[PDB]
Amino acid sequence: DNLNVRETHSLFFRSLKDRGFELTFKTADDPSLSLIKYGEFLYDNLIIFSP
Amino acid sequence: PPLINEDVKRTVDLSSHLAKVTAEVVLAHLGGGSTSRATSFLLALEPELEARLAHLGVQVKGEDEEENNLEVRERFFTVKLPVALDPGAKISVIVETVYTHVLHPYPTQITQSEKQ
């Protein structure tokens, strides 16, 4: 939501990475944001922490 | 017998549903020693497209087609020249190959009113 949320949610994401996930943090309003590209589903899991 | 190619112009045609590549290659023989043998010259294929070859042909100056024998080296194709070349001479050879089942459609699922 503000890109500083990762700092205040650090514990959850550290655990999530320790399990072995590849986390990419973006801002909900980002022009380079997309899920499918030529029918591929380049992101296998999605997490919305942006109310 | 040790020789290099001076100028090679290769054109790949993809406007079909199969890829046709044509290479004009000029074989030159480095003038080292009086060994004038220079009879057959090797031809090679990349490993990824080895199984996708269809028909390989060699034409020279527009004249009669030469004959190529499949060859294994410890795949390759050996080409027997009509007139062996002495050291210091250049021959213009044309290698034309056709590859089938090489253009994969990337979206792979296309609606009726779309492009491919």
From Swiss-Prot, chain B:
Disulfide bonds: none
Subunit annotation: Component of the oligosaccharyltransferase (OST) complex. OST exists in two different complex forms which contain common core subunits RPN1, RPN2, OST48, OST4, DAD1 and TMEM258, either STT3A or STT3B as catalytic subunits, and form-specific accessory subunits. STT3A complex assembly occurs through the formation of 3 subcomplexes. Subcomplex 1 contains RPN1 and TMEM258, subcomplex 2 contains the STT3A-specific subunits STT3A, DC2/OSTC, and KCP2 as well as the core subunit OST4, and subcomplex 3 contains RPN2, DAD1, and OST48.
Expression sites (tissue/organ): Expressed in all tissues tested.
The protein, known as: Dolichyl-diphosphooligosaccharide--protein glycosyltransferase subunit 1
Family membership: Belongs to the OST1 family.
Cell compartments where the protein resides: Endoplasmic reticulum membrane; Melanosome
PTM remark: Ubiquitinated by the ECS(ASB11) complex. Ubiquitinated by RNF128, leading to degradation in a proteasome/lysosome-dependent manner. Ufmylated by UFL1 in response to endoplasmic reticulum stress, promoting reticulophagy of endoplasmic reticulum sheets.
Role description: Subunit of the oligosaccharyl transferase (OST) complex that catalyzes the initial transfer of a defined glycan (Glc(3)Man(9)GlcNAc(2) in eukaryotes) from the lipid carrier dolichol-pyrophosphate to an asparagine residue within an Asn-X-Ser/Thr consensus motif in nascent polypeptide chains, the first step in protein N-glycosylation. N-glycosylation occurs cotranslationally and the complex associates with the Sec61 complex at the channel-forming translocon complex that mediates protein translocation across the endoplasmic reticulum (ER). All subunits are required for a maximal enzyme activity.
